[PDB]
UniProtKB/TrEMBL annotation, chain C:
<comment type="function">
    <text>Inner capsid protein that self-assembles to form an icosahedral capsid with a T=2 symmetry, which consists of 120 copies of VP2, with channels at each of its five-fold vertices. This capsid constitutes the innermost concentric layer of the viral mature particle. It encapsidates the polymerase VP1, the capping enzyme VP3 and the genomic dsRNA, thereby defining the core.</text>
</comment>
<protein>
    <recommendedName>
        <fullName>Inner capsid protein VP2</fullName>
    </recommendedName>
</protein>
<comment type="similarity">
    <text>Belongs to the rotavirus VP2 family.</text>
</comment>
<comment type="subunit">
    <text>Homodecamer; each decamer is made up of two conformers of VP2, called VP2A and VP2B. Interacts with a VP1-VP3 complex. Interacts with the intermediate capsid protein VP6. Interacts with NSP5. Interacts (via N-terminus) with NSP2.</text>
</comment>
Amino acid sequence: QFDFRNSMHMLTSNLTFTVYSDLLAFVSADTVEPINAVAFDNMRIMNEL
Amino acid sequence: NLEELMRTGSYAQITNMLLNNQPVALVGALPFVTDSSVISLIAILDATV
Amino acid sequence: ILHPIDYAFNEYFLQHQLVEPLNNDIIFNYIPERIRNDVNYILNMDRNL
């Protein structure tokens, strides 16, 4: 049987938000000039120039 | 060192100094604009570049 | 106004949402750490979240 008191509820949530997906479009990435690009040891990757 | 800054591309130190008004000396071979207007000097245009 | 079962389903959906707050810190940590430490790539958070 339908009971109003047992069926009436109060649902709570957030008012508004935006859900993003890319997560890297917010990162602006540039690269150093390739000639002076250093390896893990902090010396130029190609040092025969 | 503006040469090192341009080679590396990381504008973190200089950005922080400019935002925090920390006095600094940017060293390098720079072109300059010769201005002869006392009104400009009073207006403090040299600080807006 | 919901049946108890319908309310159970909707309450579970409301209470267990998959969305989480997003910040520049989360984006930065999502960037791979080795890329972050590499000096060949300059990464900036030029967007406001």
